[PDB]
Amino acid sequence: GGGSMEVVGDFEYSKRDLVGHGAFAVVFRGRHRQKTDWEVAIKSINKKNLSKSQILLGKEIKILKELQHENIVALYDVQELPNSVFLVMEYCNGGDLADYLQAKGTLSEDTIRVFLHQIAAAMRILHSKGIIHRDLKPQNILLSYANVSGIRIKIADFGFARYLHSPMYMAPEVIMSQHYDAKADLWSIGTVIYQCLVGKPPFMPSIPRETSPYLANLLLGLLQRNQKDRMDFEAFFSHPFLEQG
Amino acid sequence: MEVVGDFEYSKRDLVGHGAFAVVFRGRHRQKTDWEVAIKSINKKNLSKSQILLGKEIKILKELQHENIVALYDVQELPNSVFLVMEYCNGGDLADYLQAKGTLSEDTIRVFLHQIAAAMRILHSKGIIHRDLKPQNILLSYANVSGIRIKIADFGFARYLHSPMYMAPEVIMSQHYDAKADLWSIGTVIYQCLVGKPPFQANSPQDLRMFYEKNRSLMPSIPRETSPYLANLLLGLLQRNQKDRMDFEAFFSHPFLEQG
Numbered sequence: 001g002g003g004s005m006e007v008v009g010d011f012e013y014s015k016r017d018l019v020g021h022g023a024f025a026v027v028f029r030g031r032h033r034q035k036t037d038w039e040v041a042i043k044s045i046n047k048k049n050l051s052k053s054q055i056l057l058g059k060e061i062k063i064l065k066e067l068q069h070e071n072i073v074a075l076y077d078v079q080e081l082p083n084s085v086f087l088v089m090e091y092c093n094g095g096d097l098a099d100y101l102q103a104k105g106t107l108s109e110d111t112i113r114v115f116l117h118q119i120a121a122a123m124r125i126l127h128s129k130g131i132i133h134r135d136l137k138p139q140n141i142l143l144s145y146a147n148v149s150g151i152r153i154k155i156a157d158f159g160f161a162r163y164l165h166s167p168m169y170m171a172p173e174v175i176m177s178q179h180y181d182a183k184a185d186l187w188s189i190g191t192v193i194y195q196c197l198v199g200k201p202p203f204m205p206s207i208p209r210e211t212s213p214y215l216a217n218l219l220l221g222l223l224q225r226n227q228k229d230r231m232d233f234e235a236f237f238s239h240p241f242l243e244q245g
Numbered sequence: 246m247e248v249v250g251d252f253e254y255s256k257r258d259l260v261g262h263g264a265f266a267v268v269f270r271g272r273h274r275q276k277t278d279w280e281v282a283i284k285s286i287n288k289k290n291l292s293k294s295q296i297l298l299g300k301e302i303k304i305l306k307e308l309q310h311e312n313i314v315a316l317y318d319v320q321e322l323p324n325s326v327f328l329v330m331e332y333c334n335g336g337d338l339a340d341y342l343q344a345k346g347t348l349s350e351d352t353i354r355v356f357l358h359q360i361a362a363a364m365r366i367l368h369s370k371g372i373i374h375r376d377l378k379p380q381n382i383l384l385s386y387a388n389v390s391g392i393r394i395k396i397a398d399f400g401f402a403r404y405l406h407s408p409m410y411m412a413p414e415v416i417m418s419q420h421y422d423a424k425a426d427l428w429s430i431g432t433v434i435y436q437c438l439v440g441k442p443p444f445q446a447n448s449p450q451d452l453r454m455f456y457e458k459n460r461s462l463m464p465s466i467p468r469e470t471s472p473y474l475a476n477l478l479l480g481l482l483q484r485n486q487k488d489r490m491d492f493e494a495f496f497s498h499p500f501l502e503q504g
Protein backbone atom coordinates (compact mmCIF):
# COMPACT_ATOMS: atom_id res chain seq x y z
CA GLY A 1 0.00 0.00 0.00
CA GLY A 2 2.21 2.82 -1.37
CA GLY A 3 -0.85 4.98 -2.23
CA SER A 4 -2.67 7.57 0.02
CA MET A 5 -6.29 6.17 -0.08
CA GLU A 6 -7.34 2.59 0.82
CA VAL A 7 -10.64 0.63 0.54
CA VAL A 8 -11.95 -1.58 3.41
CA GLY A 9 -15.24 -3.30 2.43
CA ASP A 10 -17.85 -0.49 2.04
CA PHE A 11 -15.45 2.00 3.81
CA GLU A 12 -12.30 3.94 2.85
CA TYR A 13 -9.60 6.05 4.58
CA SER A 14 -6.65 8.27 3.64
CA LYS A 15 -3.38 7.32 5.38
CA ARG A 16 -3.18 11.16 5.87
CA ASP A 17 -5.88 10.75 8.61
CA LEU A 18 -3.96 8.54 11.17
CA VAL A 19 -5.40 9.37 14.67
CA GLY A 20 -3.56 6.90 17.01
CA HIS A 21 -2.01 3.41 17.57
CA GLY A 22 -2.92 0.26 19.54
CA ALA A 23 -1.13 -3.14 19.90
CA PHE A 24 0.38 -4.06 16.48
CA ALA A 25 -2.48 -1.70 15.35
CA VAL A 26 -2.85 1.77 13.70
CA VAL A 27 -6.17 3.74 13.67
CA PHE A 28 -7.28 6.06 10.85
CA ARG A 29 -10.37 8.28 10.54
CA GLY A 30 -12.36 6.94 7.55
CA ARG A 31 -15.87 7.07 6.03
CA HIS A 32 -18.46 5.00 4.14
CA ARG A 33 -17.66 5.16 0.38
CA GLN A 34 -21.29 6.27 -0.56
CA LYS A 35 -22.49 7.83 2.78
CA THR A 36 -19.30 9.97 3.06
CA ASP A 37 -20.67 12.13 5.95
CA TRP A 38 -20.55 8.83 8.00
CA GLU A 39 -17.09 8.96 9.72
CA VAL A 40 -15.62 5.67 11.12
CA ALA A 41 -12.41 4.53 12.85
CA ILE A 42 -10.46 1.92 10.86
CA LYS A 43 -8.10 -0.14 13.05
CA SER A 44 -5.41 -1.81 10.87
CA ILE A 45 -3.79 -4.83 12.67
CA ASN A 46 -0.58 -6.52 11.41
CA LYS A 47 -1.40 -10.29 11.15
CA LYS A 48 2.24 -11.58 11.45
CA ASN A 49 2.68 -9.42 14.63
CA LEU A 50 -0.68 -10.68 16.04
CA SER A 51 0.15 -14.38 15.22
CA LYS A 52 3.35 -14.07 17.38
CA SER A 53 1.34 -12.37 20.23
CA GLN A 54 -1.22 -13.93 22.69
CA ILE A 55 -3.92 -11.36 21.68
CA LEU A 56 -7.28 -13.09 20.99
CA LEU A 57 -8.75 -10.79 18.26
CA GLY A 58 -11.47 -13.42 17.58
CA LYS A 59 -12.64 -13.01 21.21
CA GLU A 60 -12.58 -9.17 20.96
CA ILE A 61 -14.70 -9.34 17.73
CA LYS A 62 -17.06 -11.91 19.38
CA ILE A 63 -17.63 -9.56 22.38
CA LEU A 64 -17.85 -6.32 20.28
CA LYS A 65 -20.47 -8.01 17.98
CA GLU A 66 -22.53 -9.19 21.01
CA LEU A 67 -22.58 -5.66 22.61
CA GLN A 68 -24.80 -3.12 20.82
CA HIS A 69 -24.94 -0.27 23.39
CA GLU A 70 -24.51 3.53 22.74
CA ASN A 71 -21.76 3.60 25.49
CA ILE A 72 -19.81 0.64 24.00
CA VAL A 73 -17.73 1.36 20.86
CA ALA A 74 -19.65 0.04 17.79
CA LEU A 75 -18.03 -2.54 15.44
CA TYR A 76 -19.50 -2.16 11.90
CA ASP A 77 -17.29 -4.53 9.81
CA VAL A 78 -14.19 -6.84 9.83
CA GLN A 79 -12.05 -7.17 6.63
CA GLU A 80 -9.08 -9.57 6.19
CA LEU A 81 -6.34 -8.58 3.67
CA PRO A 82 -3.23 -10.84 3.37
CA ASN A 83 -0.97 -8.63 5.62
CA SER A 84 -3.67 -6.89 7.82
CA VAL A 85 -7.02 -7.38 9.60
CA PHE A 86 -9.21 -4.19 9.56
CA LEU A 87 -11.87 -3.35 12.20
CA VAL A 88 -14.38 -0.66 11.08
CA MET A 89 -15.67 0.99 14.26
CA GLU A 90 -17.50 4.03 15.71
CA TYR A 91 -15.45 7.25 15.28
CA CYS A 92 -14.91 8.94 18.65
CA ASN A 93 -13.79 12.50 17.73
CA GLY A 94 -12.80 13.20 21.38
CA GLY A 95 -9.84 10.83 21.85
CA ASP A 96 -9.54 8.99 25.20
CA LEU A 97 -10.22 10.16 28.83
CA ALA A 98 -6.37 10.24 29.33
CA ASP A 99 -6.08 13.14 26.77
CA TYR A 100 -9.17 14.90 28.31
CA LEU A 101 -7.68 14.70 31.88
CA GLN A 102 -4.21 15.90 30.59
CA ALA A 103 -6.17 18.94 29.21
CA LYS A 104 -8.91 19.67 31.85
CA GLY A 105 -6.74 18.49 34.83
CA THR A 106 -9.29 17.41 37.49
CA LEU A 107 -13.12 17.29 36.93
CA SER A 108 -16.17 18.64 38.87
CA GLU A 109 -18.44 16.11 40.68
CA ASP A 110 -21.17 17.26 38.17
CA THR A 111 -18.82 16.29 35.25
CA ILE A 112 -17.69 12.96 36.89
CA ARG A 113 -21.42 12.02 37.47
CA VAL A 114 -22.36 12.68 33.76
CA PHE A 115 -19.38 10.44 32.69
CA LEU A 116 -19.96 7.71 35.35
CA HIS A 117 -23.72 7.52 34.43
CA GLN A 118 -22.60 6.51 30.89
CA ILE A 119 -19.77 4.14 32.11
CA ALA A 120 -22.35 2.53 34.49
CA ALA A 121 -24.78 2.18 31.51
CA ALA A 122 -22.07 0.15 29.66
CA MET A 123 -21.14 -1.84 32.85
CA ARG A 124 -24.87 -2.95 33.05
CA ILE A 125 -24.53 -4.59 29.59
CA LEU A 126 -21.19 -6.36 30.42
CA HIS A 127 -22.54 -7.62 33.82
CA SER A 128 -25.84 -8.83 32.24
CA LYS A 129 -23.91 -10.75 29.47
CA GLY A 130 -21.41 -12.00 32.15
CA ILE A 131 -18.38 -10.20 30.55
CA ILE A 132 -15.53 -8.80 32.71
CA HIS A 133 -13.47 -6.08 30.85
CA ARG A 134 -10.46 -6.34 33.29
CA ASP A 135 -8.38 -3.60 31.53
CA LEU A 136 -10.70 -0.58 32.11
CA LYS A 137 -8.61 2.66 32.29
CA PRO A 138 -8.68 6.23 30.83
CA GLN A 139 -6.84 4.99 27.63
CA ASN A 140 -9.86 2.63 26.99
CA ILE A 141 -12.63 5.20 27.64
CA LEU A 142 -13.22 7.16 24.38
CA LEU A 143 -15.09 10.50 23.96
CA SER A 144 -17.57 11.60 21.20
CA TYR A 145 -18.65 15.31 21.00
CA ALA A 146 -21.94 16.59 19.49
CA ASN A 147 -20.72 20.29 19.37
CA VAL A 148 -19.59 18.71 28.93
CA SER A 149 -23.32 17.82 28.35
CA GLY A 150 -22.38 17.29 24.64
CA ILE A 151 -19.85 14.47 25.48
CA ARG A 152 -20.84 10.80 24.96
CA ILE A 153 -18.59 8.04 26.50
CA LYS A 154 -17.78 4.69 24.77
CA ILE A 155 -15.86 1.78 26.39
CA ALA A 156 -13.26 0.13 24.09
CA ASP A 157 -10.44 -2.51 24.09
CA PHE A 158 -11.85 -5.96 25.01
CA GLY A 159 -8.34 -7.45 24.57
CA PHE A 160 -8.29 -8.64 28.22
CA ALA A 161 -12.11 -9.18 28.53
CA ARG A 162 -13.34 -12.68 29.52
CA TYR A 163 -16.76 -14.42 29.88
CA LEU A 164 -17.85 -15.73 33.32
CA HIS A 165 -18.59 -19.51 33.14
CA SER A 166 -22.12 -19.79 34.70
CA PRO A 167 -15.72 -31.90 36.55
CA MET A 168 -13.77 -34.44 38.71
CA TYR A 169 -10.67 -34.14 36.45
CA MET A 170 -10.42 -30.33 36.77
CA ALA A 171 -7.66 -28.88 39.09
CA PRO A 172 -9.08 -27.59 42.41
CA GLU A 173 -7.42 -24.10 41.99
CA VAL A 174 -9.47 -23.73 38.70
CA ILE A 175 -12.75 -25.04 40.25
CA MET A 176 -12.45 -22.62 43.22
CA SER A 177 -11.18 -19.49 41.35
CA GLN A 178 -14.38 -19.48 39.20
CA HIS A 179 -15.84 -15.88 39.42
CA TYR A 180 -12.70 -14.69 41.41
CA ASP A 181 -12.30 -11.57 39.12
CA ALA A 182 -16.13 -11.04 38.78
CA LYS A 183 -15.72 -7.56 40.42
CA ALA A 184 -12.38 -6.47 38.79
CA ASP A 185 -14.18 -3.72 36.74
CA LEU A 186 -15.65 -2.06 39.91
CA TRP A 187 -12.06 -1.48 41.27
CA SER A 188 -10.84 -0.07 37.89
CA ILE A 189 -13.86 2.32 37.64
CA GLY A 190 -12.80 3.33 41.20
CA THR A 191 -9.15 4.22 40.32
CA VAL A 192 -10.53 6.10 37.22
CA ILE A 193 -13.14 8.21 39.13
CA TYR A 194 -10.42 8.86 41.77
CA GLN A 195 -7.93 10.10 39.10
CA CYS A 196 -10.69 12.28 37.52
CA LEU A 197 -11.26 13.94 40.95
CA VAL A 198 -7.80 14.03 42.66
CA GLY A 199 -5.74 14.24 39.41
CA LYS A 200 -3.72 11.01 39.83
CA PRO A 201 -4.52 7.34 40.59
CA PRO A 202 -4.83 6.62 44.35
CA PHE A 203 -1.76 4.30 44.93
CA MET A 204 -8.52 3.22 52.40
CA PRO A 205 -7.03 6.01 50.20
CA SER A 206 -6.72 9.85 50.60
CA ILE A 207 -10.32 11.17 49.98
CA PRO A 208 -10.06 15.01 49.85
CA ARG A 209 -12.13 16.89 52.53
CA GLU A 210 -14.07 18.73 49.70
CA THR A 211 -15.50 15.37 48.39
CA SER A 212 -19.35 15.01 48.66
CA PRO A 213 -20.46 12.19 51.03
CA TYR A 214 -22.13 10.10 48.26
CA LEU A 215 -18.97 10.25 46.03
CA ALA A 216 -16.71 9.41 49.04
CA ASN A 217 -19.03 6.42 49.86
CA LEU A 218 -18.91 5.20 46.21
CA LEU A 219 -15.05 5.52 46.02
CA LEU A 220 -14.35 3.76 49.41
CA GLY A 221 -16.86 1.00 48.40
CA LEU A 222 -15.14 0.56 44.96
CA LEU A 223 -11.49 0.78 46.23
CA GLN A 224 -11.53 -2.45 48.37
CA ARG A 225 -8.34 -4.63 47.90
CA ASN A 226 -10.53 -7.76 48.66
CA GLN A 227 -13.47 -8.44 46.21
CA LYS A 228 -15.42 -10.13 49.07
CA ASP A 229 -15.55 -6.63 50.77
CA ARG A 230 -15.89 -4.59 47.50
CA MET A 231 -19.30 -3.01 46.57
CA ASP A 232 -21.40 -5.38 44.37
CA PHE A 233 -22.79 -4.27 40.95
CA GLU A 234 -26.48 -3.58 41.89
CA ALA A 235 -25.22 -1.36 44.80
CA PHE A 236 -23.01 0.53 42.25
CA PHE A 237 -25.68 0.69 39.42
CA SER A 238 -28.21 2.29 41.84
CA HIS A 239 -25.73 4.20 44.13
CA PRO A 240 -27.17 7.56 45.34
CA PHE A 241 -24.33 9.58 43.66
CA LEU A 242 -25.51 8.58 40.11
CA GLU A 243 -29.25 9.51 40.35
CA GLN A 244 -29.12 13.06 41.89
CA GLY A 245 -28.00 16.53 40.57
CA MET B 246 -20.17 -36.78 -0.29
CA GLU B 247 -20.09 -33.26 1.29
CA VAL B 248 -17.03 -31.12 0.40
CA VAL B 249 -14.95 -29.04 2.87
CA GLY B 250 -12.07 -27.25 1.03
CA ASP B 251 -9.86 -30.08 -0.39
CA PHE B 252 -11.54 -32.69 1.94
CA GLU B 253 -14.81 -34.63 1.82
CA TYR B 254 -17.00 -36.85 4.09
CA SER B 255 -20.21 -38.92 4.01
CA LYS B 256 -22.90 -37.89 6.55
CA ARG B 257 -23.07 -41.74 7.01
CA ASP B 258 -19.68 -41.54 8.84
CA LEU B 259 -20.66 -39.50 11.98
CA VAL B 260 -18.13 -40.60 14.71
CA GLY B 261 -19.39 -38.39 17.57
CA HIS B 262 -20.46 -34.98 18.95
CA GLY B 263 -18.51 -32.17 20.61
CA ALA B 264 -19.75 -28.79 21.97
CA PHE B 265 -22.33 -27.40 19.45
CA ALA B 266 -20.28 -29.68 17.11
CA VAL B 267 -20.65 -32.90 15.06
CA VAL B 268 -17.58 -34.96 13.94
CA PHE B 269 -17.41 -37.05 10.71
CA ARG B 270 -14.63 -39.36 9.42
CA GLY B 271 -13.49 -37.95 6.06
CA ARG B 272 -10.51 -37.92 3.63
CA HIS B 273 -8.56 -35.66 1.23
CA ARG B 274 -10.27 -35.59 -2.20
CA GLN B 275 -6.95 -36.46 -4.06
CA LYS B 276 -4.97 -38.27 -1.25
CA THR B 277 -7.97 -40.49 -0.32
CA ASP B 278 -5.80 -42.83 1.87
CA TRP B 279 -5.42 -39.67 4.09
CA GLU B 280 -8.27 -39.99 6.72
CA VAL B 281 -9.35 -36.83 8.63
CA ALA B 282 -11.89 -35.83 11.33
CA ILE B 283 -14.23 -33.03 10.19
CA LYS B 284 -15.73 -31.08 13.11
CA SER B 285 -18.88 -29.15 12.00
CA ILE B 286 -19.81 -26.24 14.36
CA ASN B 287 -23.11 -24.34 13.98
CA LYS B 288 -22.26 -20.57 13.91
CA LYS B 289 -25.61 -19.35 15.40
CA ASN B 290 -25.14 -21.90 18.28
CA LEU B 291 -21.49 -20.79 18.77
CA SER B 292 -22.46 -17.03 18.70
CA LYS B 293 -24.89 -17.66 21.64
CA SER B 294 -22.17 -19.63 23.56
CA GLN B 295 -18.97 -18.35 25.33
CA ILE B 296 -16.77 -20.74 23.25
CA LEU B 297 -13.75 -18.86 21.78
CA LEU B 298 -13.21 -20.94 18.59
CA GLY B 299 -10.67 -18.39 17.27
CA LYS B 300 -8.54 -19.03 20.40
CA GLU B 301 -8.71 -22.83 19.92
CA ILE B 302 -7.66 -22.43 16.22
CA LYS B 303 -4.84 -20.01 17.30
CA ILE B 304 -3.51 -22.61 19.84
CA LEU B 305 -3.95 -25.66 17.55
CA LYS B 306 -2.05 -23.75 14.74
CA GLU B 307 0.82 -22.97 17.17
CA LEU B 308 1.12 -26.69 18.29
CA GLN B 309 2.64 -29.12 15.74
CA HIS B 310 3.37 -32.18 17.94
CA GLU B 311 2.56 -35.88 17.19
CA ASN B 312 0.77 -36.14 20.61
CA ILE B 313 -1.39 -33.01 20.00
CA VAL B 314 -4.35 -33.39 17.59
CA ALA B 315 -3.39 -31.88 14.16
CA LEU B 316 -5.54 -29.05 12.64
CA TYR B 317 -5.14 -29.14 8.82
CA ASP B 318 -7.77 -26.60 7.61
CA VAL B 319 -10.60 -24.26 8.69
CA GLN B 320 -13.56 -23.67 6.29
CA GLU B 321 -16.39 -21.14 6.99
CA LEU B 322 -19.77 -21.81 5.26
CA PRO B 323 -22.70 -19.40 5.98
CA ASN B 324 -24.36 -21.68 8.64
CA SER B 325 -21.29 -23.72 9.88
CA VAL B 326 -17.51 -23.54 10.60
CA PHE B 327 -15.60 -26.79 9.79
CA LEU B 328 -12.31 -27.89 11.40
CA VAL B 329 -10.37 -30.52 9.39
CA MET B 330 -8.25 -32.46 11.91
CA GLU B 331 -6.21 -35.63 12.56
CA TYR B 332 -8.40 -38.77 12.54
CA CYS B 333 -7.98 -40.77 15.77
CA ASN B 334 -9.51 -44.20 15.00
CA GLY B 335 -9.48 -45.11 18.74
CA GLY B 336 -12.03 -42.66 20.16
CA ASP B 337 -11.31 -41.09 23.58
CA LEU B 338 -9.74 -42.60 26.77
CA ALA B 339 -13.27 -42.51 28.35
CA ASP B 340 -14.48 -45.20 25.85
CA TYR B 341 -11.21 -47.21 26.30
CA LEU B 342 -11.50 -47.19 30.17
CA GLN B 343 -15.26 -48.09 30.03
CA ALA B 344 -14.11 -51.10 27.88
CA LYS B 345 -10.75 -52.22 29.43
CA GLY B 346 -11.79 -51.21 33.03
CA THR B 347 -8.40 -50.57 34.72
CA LEU B 348 -4.95 -50.52 32.93
CA SER B 349 -1.54 -52.18 33.69
CA GLU B 350 1.35 -49.97 34.98
CA ASP B 351 3.16 -50.88 31.67
CA THR B 352 0.10 -49.55 29.70
CA ILE B 353 -0.25 -46.39 31.93
CA ARG B 354 3.54 -45.67 31.40
CA VAL B 355 3.24 -45.95 27.55
CA PHE B 356 0.24 -43.49 27.67
CA LEU B 357 1.80 -41.08 30.23
CA HIS B 358 5.10 -40.92 28.22
CA GLN B 359 3.02 -39.53 25.29
CA ILE B 360 0.89 -37.18 27.50
CA ALA B 361 4.19 -35.90 29.03
CA ALA B 362 5.57 -35.39 25.47
CA ALA B 363 2.56 -33.08 24.73
CA MET B 364 2.77 -31.37 28.18
CA ARG B 365 6.42 -30.37 27.30
CA ILE B 366 5.14 -28.44 24.24
CA LEU B 367 2.26 -26.72 26.16
CA HIS B 368 4.57 -25.73 29.09
CA SER B 369 7.30 -24.43 26.71
CA LYS B 370 4.73 -22.26 24.75
CA GLY B 371 3.15 -21.21 28.13
CA ILE B 372 -0.26 -22.84 27.26
CA ILE B 373 -2.39 -24.36 30.08
CA HIS B 374 -5.05 -26.87 28.81
CA ARG B 375 -7.05 -26.72 32.13
CA ASP B 376 -9.73 -29.26 31.02
CA LEU B 377 -7.56 -32.40 30.52
CA LYS B 378 -9.77 -35.48 31.09
CA PRO B 379 -10.43 -38.86 29.44
CA GLN B 380 -13.04 -37.28 27.02
CA ASN B 381 -10.19 -34.98 25.67
CA ILE B 382 -7.47 -37.66 25.29
CA LEU B 383 -7.87 -39.39 21.87
CA LEU B 384 -6.37 -42.74 20.72
CA SER B 385 -4.88 -43.64 17.27
CA TYR B 386 -3.94 -47.31 16.45
CA ALA B 387 -1.15 -48.17 13.92
CA ASN B 388 -2.13 -51.95 13.92
CA VAL B 389 -0.89 -51.37 23.49
CA SER B 390 2.55 -50.35 22.03
CA GLY B 391 0.64 -49.62 18.74
CA ILE B 392 -1.58 -46.94 20.45
CA ARG B 393 -0.61 -43.24 19.92
CA ILE B 394 -2.19 -40.57 22.24
CA LYS B 395 -3.29 -37.09 21.06
CA ILE B 396 -4.49 -34.30 23.39
CA ALA B 397 -7.57 -32.45 22.02
CA ASP B 398 -10.10 -29.75 23.06
CA PHE B 399 -8.30 -26.44 23.77
CA GLY B 400 -11.72 -24.84 24.42
CA PHE B 401 -10.67 -23.99 28.03
CA ALA B 402 -6.92 -23.53 27.27
CA ARG B 403 -5.27 -20.16 28.01
CA TYR B 404 -1.85 -18.49 27.48
CA LEU B 405 0.32 -17.59 30.54
CA HIS B 406 0.94 -13.78 30.50
CA SER B 407 4.79 -13.90 31.07
CA PRO B 408 -1.09 -1.14 35.74
CA MET B 409 -2.77 0.98 38.50
CA TYR B 410 -6.38 0.54 37.18
CA MET B 411 -6.13 -3.29 37.11
CA ALA B 412 -7.87 -5.05 40.06
CA PRO B 413 -5.45 -6.52 42.66
CA GLU B 414 -7.06 -10.04 42.51
CA VAL B 415 -6.24 -10.07 38.70
CA ILE B 416 -2.64 -8.81 39.17
CA MET B 417 -1.92 -11.41 41.91
CA SER B 418 -3.72 -14.48 40.35
CA GLN B 419 -1.28 -14.35 37.35
CA HIS B 420 0.22 -17.91 36.90
CA TYR B 421 -2.16 -19.32 39.64
CA ASP B 422 -3.25 -22.24 37.34
CA ALA B 423 0.28 -22.73 35.86
CA LYS B 424 0.20 -26.32 37.33
CA ALA B 425 -3.54 -27.12 36.74
CA ASP B 426 -2.67 -29.72 34.01
CA LEU B 427 -0.42 -31.71 36.44
CA TRP B 428 -3.47 -32.26 38.76
CA SER B 429 -5.72 -33.30 35.79
CA ILE B 430 -3.05 -35.80 34.52
CA GLY B 431 -3.15 -37.07 38.14
CA THR B 432 -6.97 -37.70 38.30
CA VAL B 433 -6.68 -39.39 34.84
CA ILE B 434 -3.80 -41.79 35.77
CA TYR B 435 -5.70 -42.49 39.04
CA GLN B 436 -8.92 -43.41 37.13
CA CYS B 437 -6.81 -45.55 34.70
CA LEU B 438 -5.46 -47.48 37.76
CA VAL B 439 -8.39 -47.60 40.29
CA GLY B 440 -11.27 -47.42 37.74
CA LYS B 441 -12.90 -44.20 39.05
CA PRO B 442 -11.79 -40.57 39.67
CA PRO B 443 -10.00 -39.90 43.01
CA PHE B 444 -12.75 -37.40 44.16
CA GLN B 445 -16.50 -37.37 43.20
CA ALA B 446 -19.53 -35.18 44.19
CA ASN B 447 -23.26 -35.34 43.15
CA SER B 448 -22.87 -32.01 41.19
CA PRO B 449 -20.38 -29.19 40.32
CA GLN B 450 -21.39 -27.16 43.48
CA ASP B 451 -20.86 -30.10 45.95
CA LEU B 452 -17.29 -30.47 44.52
CA ARG B 453 -16.79 -26.62 44.55
CA MET B 454 -17.51 -26.63 48.33
CA PHE B 455 -15.54 -29.94 48.86
CA TYR B 456 -12.24 -28.57 47.37
CA GLU B 457 -13.15 -25.20 49.03
CA LYS B 458 -13.38 -26.50 52.69
CA ASN B 459 -10.01 -28.39 52.10
CA ARG B 460 -11.75 -31.74 52.90
CA SER B 461 -9.45 -33.10 50.08
CA LEU B 462 -6.58 -35.30 51.46
CA MET B 463 -4.48 -37.86 49.46
CA PRO B 464 -6.62 -40.65 47.87
CA SER B 465 -6.60 -44.51 48.20
CA ILE B 466 -3.39 -45.74 46.44
CA PRO B 467 -3.71 -49.58 46.41
CA ARG B 468 -0.87 -51.49 48.28
CA GLU B 469 -0.07 -53.36 44.97
CA THR B 470 0.92 -50.01 43.26
CA SER B 471 4.67 -49.75 42.31
CA PRO B 472 6.54 -47.15 44.40
CA TYR B 473 7.45 -44.86 41.42
CA LEU B 474 3.76 -44.71 40.23
CA ALA B 475 2.54 -44.07 43.84
CA ASN B 476 5.22 -41.29 44.20
CA LEU B 477 4.12 -39.68 40.88
CA LEU B 478 0.37 -39.81 41.80
CA LEU B 479 0.81 -38.37 45.37
CA GLY B 480 3.09 -35.62 43.89
CA LEU B 481 0.47 -34.79 41.17
CA LEU B 482 -2.62 -35.02 43.48
CA GLN B 483 -1.74 -32.00 45.74
CA ARG B 484 -4.79 -29.70 46.39
CA ASN B 485 -2.30 -26.74 46.76
CA GLN B 486 -0.15 -25.96 43.61
CA LYS B 487 2.68 -24.58 45.86
CA ASP B 488 3.09 -28.23 47.14
CA ARG B 489 2.26 -29.93 43.77
CA MET B 490 5.07 -31.56 41.70
CA ASP B 491 6.71 -29.01 39.31
CA PHE B 492 6.93 -29.78 35.54
CA GLU B 493 10.68 -30.74 35.26
CA ALA B 494 10.17 -33.18 38.23
CA PHE B 495 7.20 -34.70 36.30
CA PHE B 496 8.90 -34.70 32.82
CA SER B 497 11.93 -36.63 34.23
CA HIS B 498 10.11 -38.68 36.97
CA PRO B 499 11.61 -42.20 37.38
CA PHE B 500 8.30 -43.96 36.44
CA LEU B 501 8.40 -42.65 32.82
CA GLU B 502 11.94 -43.67 31.75
CA GLN B 503 12.23 -47.32 33.01
CA GLY B 504 11.92 -50.73 31.21
Ligand SMILES: CCS(=O)(=O)Nc1ccc2c(c1)/C(=C(/Nc1ccc(CN3CCCCC3)cc1)c1ccccc1)C(=O)N2
Binds near residue numbers: 020092094095096139
Ligand atom coordinates in the same frame (compact mmCIF):
# COMPACT_ATOMS: atom_id res chain seq x y z
C1 LIG C 1 -7.36 2.40 22.58
C2 LIG C 1 -8.54 1.50 22.33
S1 LIG C 1 -8.44 0.74 20.74
O1 LIG C 1 -9.59 -0.10 20.54
O2 LIG C 1 -7.13 0.20 20.56
N1 LIG C 1 -8.55 1.94 19.75
C3 LIG C 1 -9.71 2.49 19.17
C4 LIG C 1 -10.96 1.85 19.09
C5 LIG C 1 -12.06 2.52 18.54
C6 LIG C 1 -11.88 3.85 18.16
C7 LIG C 1 -10.65 4.50 18.31
C8 LIG C 1 -9.58 3.81 18.77
C9 LIG C 1 -10.84 5.87 17.98
C10 LIG C 1 -9.97 6.90 18.26
N2 LIG C 1 -10.25 8.14 17.76
C11 LIG C 1 -9.46 9.32 17.83
C12 LIG C 1 -8.17 9.33 18.36
C13 LIG C 1 -7.49 10.52 18.53
C14 LIG C 1 -8.07 11.73 18.17
C15 LIG C 1 -7.41 13.05 18.53
N3 LIG C 1 -6.61 13.62 17.43
C16 LIG C 1 -5.42 12.78 17.14
C17 LIG C 1 -4.66 13.27 15.91
C18 LIG C 1 -5.17 14.64 15.44
C19 LIG C 1 -6.66 14.59 15.15
C20 LIG C 1 -7.41 13.77 16.20
C21 LIG C 1 -9.33 11.71 17.59
C22 LIG C 1 -10.02 10.52 17.42
C23 LIG C 1 -8.72 6.68 19.00
C24 LIG C 1 -7.66 5.99 18.41
C25 LIG C 1 -6.64 5.46 19.18
C26 LIG C 1 -6.64 5.64 20.54
C27 LIG C 1 -7.64 6.37 21.14
C28 LIG C 1 -8.67 6.89 20.38
C29 LIG C 1 -12.23 5.99 17.53
O3 LIG C 1 -12.78 6.98 17.05
N4 LIG C 1 -12.80 4.77 17.68
Ligand SMILES: CCS(=O)(=O)Nc1ccc2c(c1)/C(=C(/Nc1ccc(CN3CCCCC3)cc1)c1ccccc1)C(=O)N2
Binds near residue numbers: 330331336382
Ligand atom coordinates in the same frame (compact mmCIF):
# COMPACT_ATOMS: atom_id res chain seq x y z
C1 LIG D 1 -12.26 -34.50 21.84
C2 LIG D 1 -13.39 -33.51 21.81
S1 LIG D 1 -13.57 -32.77 20.22
O1 LIG D 1 -12.37 -32.06 19.88
O2 LIG D 1 -14.83 -32.09 20.17
N1 LIG D 1 -13.69 -33.93 19.25
C3 LIG D 1 -12.77 -34.34 18.25
C4 LIG D 1 -11.60 -33.66 17.87
C5 LIG D 1 -10.69 -34.26 16.99
C6 LIG D 1 -10.98 -35.55 16.56
C7 LIG D 1 -12.15 -36.22 16.96
C8 LIG D 1 -13.04 -35.58 17.74
C9 LIG D 1 -12.04 -37.57 16.55
C10 LIG D 1 -12.79 -38.62 17.02
N2 LIG D 1 -12.62 -39.83 16.49
C11 LIG D 1 -13.38 -41.00 16.70
C12 LIG D 1 -14.55 -40.98 17.45
C13 LIG D 1 -15.25 -42.16 17.68
C14 LIG D 1 -14.82 -43.36 17.15
C15 LIG D 1 -15.65 -44.61 17.29
N3 LIG D 1 -14.87 -45.78 17.69
C16 LIG D 1 -14.48 -45.70 19.10
C17 LIG D 1 -13.42 -46.72 19.42
C18 LIG D 1 -13.65 -47.99 18.66
C19 LIG D 1 -15.12 -48.17 18.34
C20 LIG D 1 -15.65 -47.02 17.49
C21 LIG D 1 -13.65 -43.37 16.41
C22 LIG D 1 -12.94 -42.21 16.17
C23 LIG D 1 -13.81 -38.44 18.09
C24 LIG D 1 -15.01 -37.80 17.80
C25 LIG D 1 -15.78 -37.25 18.82
C26 LIG D 1 -15.39 -37.37 20.12
C27 LIG D 1 -14.25 -38.07 20.43
C28 LIG D 1 -13.46 -38.61 19.42
C29 LIG D 1 -10.80 -37.66 15.80
O3 LIG D 1 -10.34 -38.64 15.26
N4 LIG D 1 -10.22 -36.44 15.84
